[PDB]
Design a protein around this ligand. Structure first.
Ligand SMILES: CN(C)c1cccc2c(S(=O)(=O)N3CCCC[C@H]3C(=O)N[C@@H](CCc3ccccc3)C(=O)N[C@@H](CCCNC(=N)N)C(=O)O)cccc12
Length: 131
């Protein structure tokens, strides 16, 4: 239900909002091209849970800043520290726009995600939380 956070969109048009729920440790944030490992839960503004990696056997991974994930994610994950838990509000322009993604995402939908950054694999260094 709530759309909260700092506007972190490069154009500064409130397209991507972020709230840190748990501060991460370290100082390093993943770079463009780094492989990032997260756990997430995604909800529509009406509180409807459309997807969660927690329901699966391992973390969700992809290469940062390569357009493999919605724009909002490439923006938001680049601002995360390892061990950080945040809430991201994604406006449709930074998500699935007017088309949506049937059947779980309707047209012009604002998405809410709770994301935890577990690890990132850089060119020379890998950074992860303990476990
Ligand atoms: C394909 N279908 C059925 C879905 C599978 C899985 C998740 C889906 C989600 S989700 O839960 O909101 N999700 C996962 C992580 C958070 C972001 C978001 C996401 O992003 N996903 C990717 C697809 C990931 C995937 C995972 C497993 C199997 C297949 C696909 C996605 O859409 N990429 C877009 C990006 C276009 C970016 N242009 C641009 N100009 N930067 C695409 O390349 O077309 C929502 C809707 C469909 C989901």
């Amino acid at each position: 239900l709530p759309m909260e956070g700092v506007d972190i969109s490069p154009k500064q048009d409130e397209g991507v909002l972020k709230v840190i729920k748990r501060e991460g440790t370290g100082t390093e944030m993943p770079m463009i091209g780094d492989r990032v490992f997260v756990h997430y839960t995604g909800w529509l503004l009406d509180g409807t849970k459309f997807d969660s990696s927690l329901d699966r056997k391992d973390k969700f991974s992809f290469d940062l800043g390569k357009g493999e994930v919605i724009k909002a994610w490439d923006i938001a994950i680049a601002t995360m520290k390892v061990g950080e838990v945040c809430h991201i509000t994604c406006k449709p322009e930074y998500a699935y726009g007017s088309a949506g993604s049937p059947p779980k995402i309707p047209p012009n939908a604002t998405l809410v995600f709770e994301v935890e950054l577990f690890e990132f694999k850089g060119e020379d260094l890998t950074e992860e939380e303990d476990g």
